[PDB]
Design a protein around this ligand. Structure first.
Ligand SMILES: [Cl-]
Ligand SMILES: [Cl-]
Ligand SMILES: [Cl-]
Ligand SMILES: [Cl-]
Lengths: 54, 66
């Protein structure tokens, strides 16, 4: 029970820094994944069009 | 009795020290992760912009040949 309060009280301290950094990490991971899907889709479209011209 | 108070104070200070250490480690690791992710997202964003440009141009060509 003493280590529960020790760890909880520990993490509650100045947790706003780690929360800002972790949130930013989340946004950047999502933006990353969606950018990757956009790149794949755009490459498929590019190959398609190039096929169309010929 | 005073020795008990001194000992609990010592334990408290130690737990605080190790807490601060682990916290700073986490903050450093997160900062590095954010920097890396920003770099990767810059490269990916530039690649996406170039690809959108190329697709637009290709569409222009297909249309011009109608
Ligand atoms: Cl701790
Ligand atoms: Cl922490
Ligand atoms: Cl560009
Ligand atoms: Cl078209």
């Amino acid at each position: 029970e003493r280590n529960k309060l020790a760890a909880a009280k520990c993490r509650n301290r100045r947790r706003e820094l780690t929360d800002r950094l972790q949130a930013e990490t989340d946004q950047l991971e999502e933006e990353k994944a969606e950018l990757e899907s956009e790149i794949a889709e755009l490459q498929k479209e590019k190959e398609r069009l190039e096929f169309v011209l010929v | 009795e005073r020795i008990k108070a001194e000992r609990k104070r010592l334990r408290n200070r130690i737990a605080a020290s190790k807490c601060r250490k682990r916290k700073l480690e986490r903050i450093s690791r997160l900062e590095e992760k954010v920097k890396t992710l920003k770099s990767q997202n810059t490269e990916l964003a530039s690649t996406a912009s170039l690809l959108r440009e190329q697709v637009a141009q290709l569409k222009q060509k297909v249309l011009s040949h109608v």
